[PDB]
């Protein structure tokens, strides 16, 4: 079915520009619309969409309505201009999901066998690659609950297209690209420890909270399982590198050797040729 989704900045903006539409008139809830997907393969892609007036009451927390006269005839519009573009699901800006979201997908399953919902974010904050994606399946449960319909997270990734980077990538103009090979990889390293070890502390504090409160989630078992896959090397005191010690510097063996060999001859190219051309102009002029 649906494994991963591809969200373009163009269709994501179609949720963002509608945040100006109903944001000025208010009032409650969020921006919600129906998603037009482009499915060429198991990997899902999204090009365009259409935003529909939508509201969700608080009291009355289970009340939701799409406008389906907007959904029907406007489909024949986008279908007439683009035959490949069809509705794969819906979307909204979240930020989180209330329990009522179970009924939005099951209603529109007449349009698509499986409707994928995309939670987006109009204001970028944290922690990383934004928005979100969910898929609607039924896993029931191990405890014996009646059949449980819970949306499972779908990994979301941004993607590009021809001719769409004209105006999009133009307006920024302030970015330095990249530079690959010097700063590009090292800034990630400073962040790889930051973003790597912050979720380490956020989860290890919530995993300690388990014993305290919030149990379940037990989880189970996914938590410790892949944590023990992380445990191929801990790495703890001290590094257990006795076999990887001589191999540590042995990987730095040729990297330092070439860096010593290149800088020697690069100098011979830089130093000699500079002295030659310099004294040819300098002393022959005066």
């Amino acid at each position: 079915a649906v494994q991963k989704v591809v969200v373009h900045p163009l269709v994501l903006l179609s949720v963002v520009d509608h945040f100006n539409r109903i944001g000025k008139v208010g009032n409650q809830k969020r921006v919600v619309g129906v998603l037009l997907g482009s499915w060429q393969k198991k990997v899902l892609d999204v090009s365009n969409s259409f935003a529909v007036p939508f509201d969700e009451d608080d009291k009355d927390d289970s009340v939701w309505f799409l406008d389906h006269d907007y959904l029907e005839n406007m489909y024949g519009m986008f279908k007439k201009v683009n035959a490949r573009e069809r509705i794969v699901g819906w979307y909204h800006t979240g930020p989180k999901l209330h329990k009522n979201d179970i009924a939005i997908n099951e209603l529109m399953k007449r349009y698509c066998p499986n409707s994928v919902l995309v939670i987006i974010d109009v204001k970028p904050k944290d922690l990383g690659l934004p928005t979100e994606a969910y898929i609607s399946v039924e896993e029931v449960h191990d405890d014996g609950t009646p059949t449980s319909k819970t949306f499972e997270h779908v990994t979301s990734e941004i993607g590009a297209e021809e001719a769409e980077e004209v105006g999009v990538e133009h307006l920024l103009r302030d970015i330095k690209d990249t530079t690959v090979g010097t700063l590009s990889q090292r800034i990630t390293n400073q962040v790889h420890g930051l973003k790597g070890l912050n979720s380490k502390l956020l989860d290890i504090r919530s995993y300690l909270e388990k014993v305290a409160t919030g149990k379940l989630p037990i989880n189970h078992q996914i938590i410790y399982q892949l944590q023990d896959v992380f445990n191929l090397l801990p790495d703890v005191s001290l590094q257990e590198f006795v076999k990887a010690f001589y191999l540590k510097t042995n990987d730095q063996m040729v990297v330092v050797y070439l860096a010593s060999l290149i800088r020697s001859v690069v100098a011979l190219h830089n130093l000699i040729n500079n002295k030659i051309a310099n004294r040819d102009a300098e002393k022959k002029e005066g």
Binding site: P9, L10, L13, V16, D17, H18, N20, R21, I22, V25, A51, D67, Y70, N73, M77, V81, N82, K123, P124, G128, P130, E157, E161, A163, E164, E165, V166, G167, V168, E169, H170, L171, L172, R173, I175, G181, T182, Q185, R186, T188, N189, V191, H192, K195, D235, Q239, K248, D251, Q252, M253, V255, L258, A259, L261, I262, V265, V266, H269, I276, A277
Partner: protein, 278 residues
Amino acid sequence: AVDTAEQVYISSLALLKMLKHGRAGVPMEVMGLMLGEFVDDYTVRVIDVFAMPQSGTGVSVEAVDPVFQAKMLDMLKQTGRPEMVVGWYHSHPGFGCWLSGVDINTQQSFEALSERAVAVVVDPIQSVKGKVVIDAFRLINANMMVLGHEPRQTTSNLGHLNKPSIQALIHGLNRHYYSITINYRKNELEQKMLLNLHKKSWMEGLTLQDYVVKEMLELAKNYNKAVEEEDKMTPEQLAIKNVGKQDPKRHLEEHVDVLMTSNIVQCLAAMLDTVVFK
């Protein structure tokens, strides 16, 4: 009577369907419609752009369905903003995006409907990322040849847009037409996330993910050694000697600075041992 140079405020949402709907018609030319509000004579804004059915038999003035707009405006009422129509646009991917013979026939028809009806063209081909490309024009009336034929006041917004002058046939259409200035009213809220969504997705996906060892340096040493002798024969070729050969010639680049950065790639990637671990 009084005519002042117009300034076009385009919304980042209206910029989407210009290139996107134009990409769907590639290679063939499409016909769209511009949506916006007329503030005054010297400024104009396009707040929305929508897609219109592409013509596989060629663009015509009847390609726009009036019941398509009448059903669209009604759907814009239940949508947040029901703004009145303004003008039209069309893609021209196959060439340098100039107004064709059909574009002038649909001018007097659209300029009768709406006052301005700015003619807007767009092309995918001229660039990819860092150029505005697109196009825009506005019909100056040929009946005005009896009157003064050189609008507009506040000139160089035209005059500067009259640069580069874009070859000949394009500005050959400057007879009976005059282009219009396109500036971006700030969407920067969306434009700030446009940079954040683009670069974060391009930074190692987590920034973590991405962060032929000696052999890649054995393949590099062929570029770091076997390339040296073909590079270091040139200073012996600079020795004539002396001097019958035409000079100067500079062979210093680009291999020297490439092997520099080649070590910059290999040194900081080897620092991943010291960086990631401890």
